Curated annotation (Swiss-Prot), chains A, B, C, D:
Utilization of photosynthesis-related QTLs can enhance high-yield breeding and provide a new strategy for achieving increased rice productivity. Involved in the regulation of lateral leaf growth. May be involved in the regulation of basipetal polar auxin transport (PAT) and vascular patterning in leaves. Controls photosynthesis rate by regulating carboxylation efficiency and consequently photosynthesis rate. Controls panicle and spikelet numbers, and grain yield. Disruption phenotype: Narrow leaf phenotype. Reduced leaf blade width and plant height. Altered internode elongation pattern. Altered vascular patterns in leaves and culms. It comes from the Eukaryota. Signal peptide: none annotated. Its main location: nucleus. GO terms for cellular component: cytoplasm; nucleoplasm. Expressed in leaf sheaths, leaf blades, culms and panicles. Preferentially expressed in vascular tissues in leaves and culms. The keyword Cytoplasm applies. One of its GO terms (biological process) is internode patterning. Keywords: Cytoplasm, Developmental protein, Nucleus. This is Protein NARROW LEAF 1. The chain holds residues 50 to 461 of 582 of the full protein. It is found in: Nucleus, Nucleoplasm; Cytoplasm.
Length: 395, 395, 395, 395
């Protein structure tokens, strides 16, 4: 059955966060890493939640393009000239963090969709005409279908070989078992029972997820929704491929480090292979999107992606897809995130004038998600067989 | 008033069909005519109705294009790889009929629309700005409007001169008389009395329509919906034209023979002149579409048309249009069918990947429809005057 | 296939009606029969259609109760005082027919419902818990279910034994055969195949139906919608009962004669054994309800019934029920009509103040309906066996 | 995070159930306990799932009243006479279990509502006008509100004092923490923080819940949805009352034993205190309602309640209420179940004719729910203080 932290171990966690912010209450060093940006945002969250639709961290967008400027991205429903703004409502272009670390502030017109289609040979193969199951393939529950993220393997225990996808796609907490079928469930069409979810994460506190206190709100949670489905005993493991169709072979997970310079993650081009839209390319415009609900709980999603060439990055049903960094200097592409599914997982964002608002996509940090679920992504078909061999004699 | 066959004369037809099937229960001769394809389909209908949305006969579609291979087309809601198919679900690629006659089996992704717009000079003329009434012109009842099929003439009796159109467009069996008006009825706009329906066909059994037993179901009916509207006495017959605008003069009806080779009908380019779509071109992809309803009665529609150049072939309101075979070797075009109207008259079909599923149109065999209604199409304006002369002194 | 009268035989029928009204264009004899009332209404229809929602013939309703006064009932959407009426719009209280025959005029506030539930032991028995099939029992098509009217028998030919019900309940002119099942069709629940409709009437002209010209409109039709369903060979005829549950044994059809005094039909209490309402009682408030549609065709329904005790007389699904005259002087009750089904078959009517407007029910003259369908109602279970015996050796 | 049983330990349970059924494949002893009824139902489930909406065990209902006859209740959408039934469709009146144990079969017309208001002084007190919190009081999450079941206490560990309610009311598995507020959440109205859910059950397999194999389906689950909310540290515990308003003091949980005679549970009058409808009385008409979904998994809910005096037993929002057995022989009332919330938690049922179908309510066995959640109901206000005293010094 289900468990939640009690009143104890939460006030102790709340005092550990309040103490961190209490004690630490431009000619300084400019913020250069994600850690500094999140620290400044957390230490100025009270003035940033006043008239904003959300906050994030990334490079400033000026005249529609990234400017390689460390900043906190403040999201507003409608952005007007400061001549028509109240002096209180006007956001400051400079924010000072503890120790003199500072950054700029970006104002972006922003919106959400709410609760979450095209046609190609690749899309049809992923939807069921292919001879192999791999990253990008359709996965379906009895009511919801999405995209297969990656072929993973449990680190400890039985070391089962399975696949990772979005929790909302794979798991419905109104049903006893979360069975998964590739093309469709038996009630909706042809399909083969891939397996059932055996572990899934829904919400992780920011201190456990990032390792720091991303906000002053004691009720701060990350939207890391990932479900691990181990392949069934009767399922044909010979039909599982580790090649991500549309991009090819991939590398190990590129863990996003909060100490690294922002250019290592923000602004880097990404690719994706999903069920609905197939292969699409985009750019990581922001990180650690901070959303504050009307009920007083701070929500975090890791990656913000805007589709390149003004096209969209994902459609409905693309959730649970790998967000893979493209080949930087000719090396293997490396996944960095899974496409988050759920309410307000996508929306409209305003980068450039002379054209309509852009579509933005939220993502979940893949390295931290696998660390929390204790899974290893299988990137080689030879290593896939070894992991199956390692699982056969382990039981 | 209305009549239906009683319990007698329906059983006598029931064992008449059953006897034909009971007694007759690859190194043989391959099927080459529509008769052989329908025979094989009828003798294997039990294993083809299991997991299909319907069945037709035509040339196999491989890679999205016709492959001049005699085959039985099995329509499925979603076509997946046989790796994800149960062995029972998987269809056989070869079917054996009585006497060794055999054919291939083609699996097509299929869907239906249900219960059933563009702008050009031709469309405007057909909708009411033209000086003449002919094939393709708009015809309207008090609630439903459609397309005038062709100018026809009764073979026997009064030899009345009128026009043929779809039964659903012209006839509503909740109203005393089925009055018809060209542009619109008086309650919806300007118009003149074309006349009223005096005879209309709704359903003909397969043994009477095709001359053979197209299926093992005793309740097998052909959806041949054609209504004959003789022109009124006060209607100006001088404004009726036999020229099909958009294609010109036409020839007599090309009767579809079940003995002839499949290439004479299947895969041959067709043209149509209706309303809300004007002149369009398409290809006959299948014949004798067998649809089985949830209530245990087999339904048949003759022609299956997919619009050429990936464009649609008809829209709503095109029902009752001539399906005319285009000029084969420079001779006059000849009509082969009328566009059927009614529930699931059109739908969506999947030939090629890399683009969306295509629209398909159903049609009713024109030669057999006229044989059942005892009408002759007037193809020459000189013959139209003679037919009016023959009708004037006959009364 | 379907047939309709052509241009000929309709102008000849139109001239036979125009001649009747042309040649014949208070101190006289007051109207006393239905014939006189319909004659006066037909000869004054032009001034009665001006600002009325319909017309009928019956006894005048003053202060909410019948007054035993011959009159033409003029139906209005809203009835106001003549002080607020235009002098042209005000209806005349006296109408003069040919030969000096005259009647009063009644203004009744009227409305219609449009396109067409309680619980008792009798209702449950009729809906399927009973051991017998009879008048009032449920009959269901594949999409529509209604009430079994009466057990009938064809006069000529095979002399098949079956039952009569509403055409709209039993007949759908979009389907090949109109199969009937008592409780429910197989796709909706348990049931036995009662048989299929073999003959059904939809519209009969007034000259054929009543024997006179009920109106000046050449396009005048009666709404007689009755369908005869002969019982199947495999159907268990031993389970058919001729007893109308809730009223008992009945007599032969009481044909409504246009020469008789109005008290013989108008104002006489009626009973009905249908379904979704069970046994209900009402009063025949009007006869020959004349409705004029927006398209210029005059429609007629025979019987107008208002439920007694201010309760409703029928609900949706009661269509096809016997309208039976109650025991006048202790003799057997006799059916006079079938409950008509179809658009605007029921509606809301205003008799009395101090309470809401009442519900009215339309009916179809049963004697004329059986004359047109050539059926005899079986009223005795002994006669039912004889009719089955007479049908067994006749084939 | 969430966990589910893997492929192992489920096949081991699957063959454990299969072995029990394979080896054991009226002049015998009649069934007299719930165990025997469920055994016979499990051994005949294949022939009972054919044409039924579900199955339960209890006393036979004949003429609308319980007949103190051990029987298996088979629920049908519509119950008709066997004359209109297919002989295959007709259910047998006698069922034989292993060892000769037998029972009757009762057919009931059944329906379900789907996804789930009165005005009295008691209702207002429960909804928020009262000075104390107890059984029947309103409890609200941020989106769903329901009824407080009972004041409970953890058996082991911290021994926290809290309350039990429905899982669907208290827990939403799309939100980080399941906060609970009595009158309304802060976003919907006044109210204070009662606490948050720290443990909740959703589905328990039948072998763990009942201790037996209630069905042949390997995927058999009991819909036991209960959530425990420990009262907050800052919450005023002095305002919690153990008196169930409308019935008074209660006793300990009466555990339903599968060995005891059927009269101890089935047919016994019950009472309930819910926010929506206040105090209502009903009768336990069936036990262990077996519902089979379209996806092949068997669902079980424990108690079936029909409101007494033909009134309804609960309304929407009454979920999470105590189902309390009324005073049998003057002793203290004892709770036996919690009102289940969720899809198809209630519905409509047909006992008696001459009136509308009755409303039925599903319930969850309280004793087994507390055994699975390890909670003890506090029935005395003096014991409530001691439980709070025991919790204060334990930390
Ligand atoms: N609370 C607010 N709501 C709406 N608009 C605001 C708010 N606070 C500031 N703004 C607007 O946002 C502007 C700042 O925009 P921003 O920081 O994105 O500039 P930039 O990146 O240098 O350039 P650009 O707008 O061309 O991208 C202010 O000048 C003001 O017009
Ligand atoms: N019952 C079924 N439901 C869904 N898909 C099915 C079913 N039976 C077979 N199929 C699929 O249909 C395929 C057969 O396709 P088909 O016969 O149309 O091939 P083709 O014409 O040679 O080539 P192409 O598919 O390129 O047009 C099988 O390989 C299988 O994947
Ligand atoms: N075209 C019309 N539209 C609406 N109301 C009309 C129209 N013509 C007449 N009336 C109203 O109808 C009245 C006549 O009503 P009616 O003939 O039913 O009287 P009654 O039967 O003697 O009495 P009661 O109204 O009590 O039944 C007129 O006085 C006038 O107010
Ligand atoms: N599959 C089925 N679907 C619908 N109705 C059925 C089915 N099988 C049996 N029945 C009906 O249910 C009846 C049995 O009812 P049941 O066993 O409840 O009777 P009872 O309790 O003795 O009396 P009462 O019906 O008055 O409660 C059968 O006679 C038949 O009419
Ligand atoms: Mg900007
Ligand atoms: Mg093909
Ligand atoms: Mg009046
Ligand atoms: Mg019963």
């Amino acid at each position: 059955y289900f468990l939640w932290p009690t009143s104890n171990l939460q006030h102790c966690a709340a005092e550990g966060r309040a103490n961190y912010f209490g004690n630490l209450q431009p000619k300084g060093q400019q913020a250069n890493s994600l850690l500094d940006l999140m620290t400044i945002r957390a230490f100025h969250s009270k003035i940033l939640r006043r008239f904003s639709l959300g906050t994030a961290v990334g490079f400033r967008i000026r005249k529609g393009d990234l400017t390689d400027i460390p900043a906190i991205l403040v999201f507003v429903a409608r952005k007007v000239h400061k001549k028509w703004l109240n002096p209180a409502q006007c956001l400051p272009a400079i924010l000072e963090g503890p120790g003199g670390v500072w950054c700029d502030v970006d104002v972006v017109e922003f919106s959400y969709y709410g609760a979450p289609q095209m046609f190609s040979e690749l899309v049809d193969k992923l939807c069921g005409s292919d001879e192999c199951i791999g990253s990008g393939s359709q996965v379906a529950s009895h009511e919801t279908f999405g995209t297969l993220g990656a072929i993973v393997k449990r680190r400890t225990g039985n070391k089962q070989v399975g696949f990772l996808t979005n929790r909302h796609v794979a798991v419905d907490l109104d049903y006893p078992n979360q069975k998964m079928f590739h093309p469709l469930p038996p009630n909706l069409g042809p399909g083969v029972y891939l397996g059932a979810v055996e572990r899934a994460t829904s919400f992780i506190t920011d201190d456990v997820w990032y390792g720091i206190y991303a906000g002053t709100n004691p009720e701060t949670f990350v939207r890391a929704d990932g479900a691990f489905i181990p392949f069934a005993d009767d399922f044909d493991i010979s039909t599982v491929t580790t090649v991500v169709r549309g991009v090819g072979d991939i590398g190990d997970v590129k863990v996003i480090d909060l100490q690294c310079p922002l250019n290592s993650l923000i602004g880097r081009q990404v690719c994706k292979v999903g069920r609905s839209s197939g292969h699409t390319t985009g750019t990581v415009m922001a990180y650690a999107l901070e959303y504050n609900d009307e009920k007083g709980i701070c929500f975090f999603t890791d990656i913000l992606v805007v589709g390149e060439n003004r096209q969209t990055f994902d459609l409905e049903g693309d959730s649970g897809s790998l967000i893979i960094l493209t080949s930087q200097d000719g090396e293997k592409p490396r996944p960095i995130g899974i496409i988050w599914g759920g309410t307000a997982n996508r929306g409209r964002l305003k980068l450039t004038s002379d054209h309509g608002p852009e579509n933005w996509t939220s993502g979940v940090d893949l390295g931290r998600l696998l660390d929390r679920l204790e899974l290893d992504i299988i990137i080689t078909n030879e290593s896939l067989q070894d992991a199956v061999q390692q699982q056969r004699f382990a039981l």
